[PDB]
Amino acid sequence: HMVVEHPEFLKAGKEPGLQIWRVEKFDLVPVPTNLYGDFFTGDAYVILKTVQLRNGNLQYDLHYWLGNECSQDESGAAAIFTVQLDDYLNGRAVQHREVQGFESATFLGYFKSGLKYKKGGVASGFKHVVPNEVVVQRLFQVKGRRVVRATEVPVSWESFNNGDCFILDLGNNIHQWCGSNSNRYERLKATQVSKGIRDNERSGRARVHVSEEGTEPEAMLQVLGPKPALPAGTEDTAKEDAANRKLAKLYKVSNGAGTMSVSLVADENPFAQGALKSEDCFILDHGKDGKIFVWKGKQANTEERKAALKTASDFITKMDYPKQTQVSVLPEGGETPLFKQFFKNWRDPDQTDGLGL
C-alpha cells in the first residue's frame, strides 16, 4: 500500500463534486469542465465522485470506463491509475468497471444530460513490434590467403567469383557458397563466420546451409535469379593479404587524462583482444562498406559513451562514407562476430580449451 506522489493527484477529492480524467500515452490529463458527460469511443477514462456525509466524513467512488475501440494501453492505464488513486487515498473508496454501451444504472445517474459518444481519440503509446522477427538480405564475400576477411557486397549474380567464398544472409536461412577455386582458409573462415552469425546475431534461430556449384538450393535461385556463367577467380596472392591488413582503424576515447581524447590504437589487423580496456571506450571503423562499431566498457563513464557516439557520427561526414553506414553499439560480452574477425584469437569466457570434458 505504498503511496504515490504524482503532483496532479493533489487536487483530487478535496471538495465534494465530480472529476473526470482522460488517458493520453501512459499519463492523466484532466478534461475541461464543458467537456463533461461525453466521452471518446477510442479512449479510456477515470471517474471520481466524492460526496459529503451528515456526520462529517467524505466518501469517494471510483469508476474506470473503457471504450469498444480503445487500445490495450489505455484500458490498462485506466485500471492502474484507478488502483494508484485508491492507494493514494486511505482505502475508503470503491472501484467499478464501466463498459461502453453496457454502463451501470448508477453511472447513467451521475450525468444529468446523458451519454454521447464520438469517434476517434488519442493514439496509443505502444509501438508495433512482433516477437522474434528478422528482415535481412545481405551478401558477404570472404577472401584471403592468410589474413582472411569479410566484405559486404551487393546482392547480385555478377558479384560472384569462383576464387573466394560467399555468405548469403536471408533471415532464418543462411547459405554458404564455396567456389571451386576457393582454398582451405577462406572455407574455414566462411564456416566460422556462418556459425557466428547463426549463434550470436540470431542466437541459434537460423539454419546454415552449405552448397557449391551445381547444388544451389531453390532459395538462392529464387532470390538471386538464374545462374549465369561465372567469371573464374584470381589465384590467392599476398597483395590482398596486405589489403585485408589495411581495412580497420581501432581508436580510443577515454577521460583518464582529465580531458577529451580521441587517439589511434591501431591501424593493422589482427588486433589484440587485451587492447580493449574495460574502463574506456573504443571505435572500430570498417566504413568502406559502411560499418562502424562503438564498443563500450562496463566501467566507462556516460560522457565517454556519448562522446564516442558523437565522434562515430562525425566519421560519416569527415571521411565521406556512403549513406548506408550503420552505427552498431556493442557492450562487453555481446560482440557482433563481424567485429570479432579483426582480432587475433578472440576468446569468449566460457570457451572449451583442448578436447574438453
Binding site: 560480452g333 566460457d350 572449451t352
Partner: protein, 372 residues
C-alpha cells in the same frame, strides 16, 4: 531519457524486451545445456555451456537443465547465465544504463527475493530495479482490477483472487501440474503406438507435438466413442528424422490430465474445482464480481475448447442463480510481459524504482518495503 527493460522469467519460457511495446522482443526457453561428448574439432568456437535457443538448436549433443523448476529459482549460477545471455546476447544492451523490471511467482520465499536483488545489483550493476507478481500484472493486462487469475505456465498452475487491485494471501492456491507434466504424460501414452522418446533431447519434439496437435474435448466419453469407432480425428506428424507418426485418441487425452489428475496418479483436484475451492475461501460480498472475471493466462491456455469446457465445468458445480463467463484474450500467453511493459512505462513509476543509492544504505532488504 533511457528506456526500461521488462524480463518475465518463466519456468520453461523466458520473455524479455523494452518498456512501452505491444509484444515482447525476445521469447526463448530458459534452458542451460552442457556437452555430453568430447570436442575433437578444436579451435572452432566450442563452448562449455550453451544457453538459450542456441542450446535448443544443437539439442542432440547436449544435456539440458532447467534452472527454474516449479516457478521457483533453484540453480542460481545457471540463472545468472540466463540473465547474462538475456542482457548481452538477446537484448544487446548494457544493464548499467537501463532500469530492469522483473516478475516473480506468487508466494515466493523472501530469501529468493533478496538474492534476486543481490545478483541484479552487484553482478550486472543496474541503476534501478523492481519486482512484481505474475497474476496481478495479468489482471492489469486484462484491463480489470478485481478477479481470479488461473496462471498455468510450464511449471505450476496458480489460482489468485484479487480485490481492489491487490491479491488476498490467504486465498492464492497452487496446483502442481502444467505443460511439463502434460509433455511427460504424452511421452507415456505414445509408447503403445511403438514410438519411443526417453531422453531430454526429444522432449521438445513431444512438446511441439503437444503444441501443434492438441484440443480439449467438451465431453470426453462420446469423444472416446467416436475415436474408437471412426478415425476422422487421426492425424500425422513429421518428425525431423523424416519418420511420419500418426496420432489418434492421444491428441485430446493429453489435455484431460488437467481435469483428471488421476491419469498421472496424484490425489489432488482438477483445474476446474480448485477455482471453486479458492473462491469459497474468499469473503461472500466480493464473489458477485469474482466469478464474473475469470482471467485465463499462461501458455497452457492455448488449447482450443478450453474455454467452453471451463464454462461447462464451472456452470455444472456453481449454483444456478448466477451467470458465469470465461474470458481468454489471444495475447494471454504474453500478458505478464504486456503488464510489465505498461507498468514500466507509466508517469508514476519513476518514484517506485529502487535506485542504486537506496540499495547502498539499506542492503538487500529495501525490496520488501517498496515492492509491496
Amino acid at each position: 531519457e533511457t528506456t526500461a527493460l521488462v524480463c518475465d522469467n518463466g519456468s520453461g519460457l523466458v520473455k524479455a524486451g523494452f518498456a512501452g511495446d505491444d509484444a515482447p522482443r525476445a521469447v526463448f526457453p530458459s534452458i542451460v545445456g552442457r556437452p555430453r561428448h568430447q570436442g575433437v574439432m578444436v579451435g572452432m568456437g566450442q563452448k562449455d555451456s550453451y544457453v538459450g535457443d542456441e542450446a535448443q538448436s544443437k539439442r542432440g549433443i547436449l544435456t539440458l537443465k532447467y534452472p527454474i523448476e516449479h516457478g521457483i529459482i533453484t540453480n542460481w549460477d545457471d540463472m545468472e547465465k540466463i540473465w547474462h545471455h538475456t542482457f548481452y546476447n538477446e537484448l544487446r544492451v548494457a544493464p548499467e544504463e537501463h532500469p530492469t523490471l522483473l516478475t516473480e511467482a506468487p508466494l515466493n520465499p523472501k530469501a529468493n527475493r533478496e538474492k534476486m536483488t543481490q545478483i541484479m545489483f552487484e553482478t550486472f550493476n543496474v541503476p534501478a530495479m523492481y519486482v512484481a507478481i505474475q497474476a496481478v500484472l495479468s489482471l492489469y493486462a486484462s484491463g480489470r482490477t478485481t478477479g481470479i487469475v488461473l496462471d498455468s505456465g510450464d511449471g505450476v498452475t496458480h489460482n489468485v483472487p484479487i480485490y481492489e487491485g491487490y491479491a488476498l494471501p490467504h486465498a492464492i492456491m497452487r496446483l502442481d501440474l502444467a505443460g511439463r507434466d502434460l509433455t511427460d504424460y504424452l511421452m507415456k501414452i505414445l509408447t503403445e503406438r511403438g514410438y519411443s522418446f526417453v531422453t531430454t533431447a526429444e522432449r521438445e519434439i513431444v512438446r511441439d507435438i503437444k503444441e501443434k496437435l492438441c484440443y480439449v474435448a467438451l465431453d470426453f466419453e462420446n469423444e472416446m466413442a467416436t475415436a474408437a469407432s471412426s478415425s476422422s480425428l487421426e492425424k500425422s506428424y513429421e518428425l525431423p528424422d523424416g519418420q511420419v507418426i500418426t496420432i489418434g485418441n492421444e491428441r485430446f487425452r493429453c489435455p484431460e490430465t488437467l481435469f483428471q489428475p488421476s491419469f498421472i496418479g496424484m490425489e489432488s483436484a482438477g483445474i476446474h474445482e480448485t477455482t471453486y475451492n479458492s473462491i469459497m475461501k474468499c469473503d461472500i460480498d466480493i464473489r458477485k464480481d469474482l466469478y464474473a472475471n475469470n482471467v485465463m493466462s499462461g501458455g497452457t491456455t492455448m488449447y482450443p475448447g478450453i474455454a467452453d469446457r471451463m464454462q461447462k465445468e464451472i456452470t455444472a458445480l456453481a449454483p444456478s442463480t448466477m451467470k458465469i463467463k470465461i474470458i481468454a484474450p489471444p495475447e494471454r500467453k504474453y500478458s505478464v510481459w504486456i503488464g510489465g511493459s505498461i507498468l514500466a512505462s507509466l508517469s508514476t513509476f519513476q518514484q517506485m524504482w529502487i535506485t542504486k543509492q537506496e540499495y547502498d544504505e539499506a542492503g538487500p532488504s529495501i525490496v520488501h518495503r517498496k515492492c509491496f
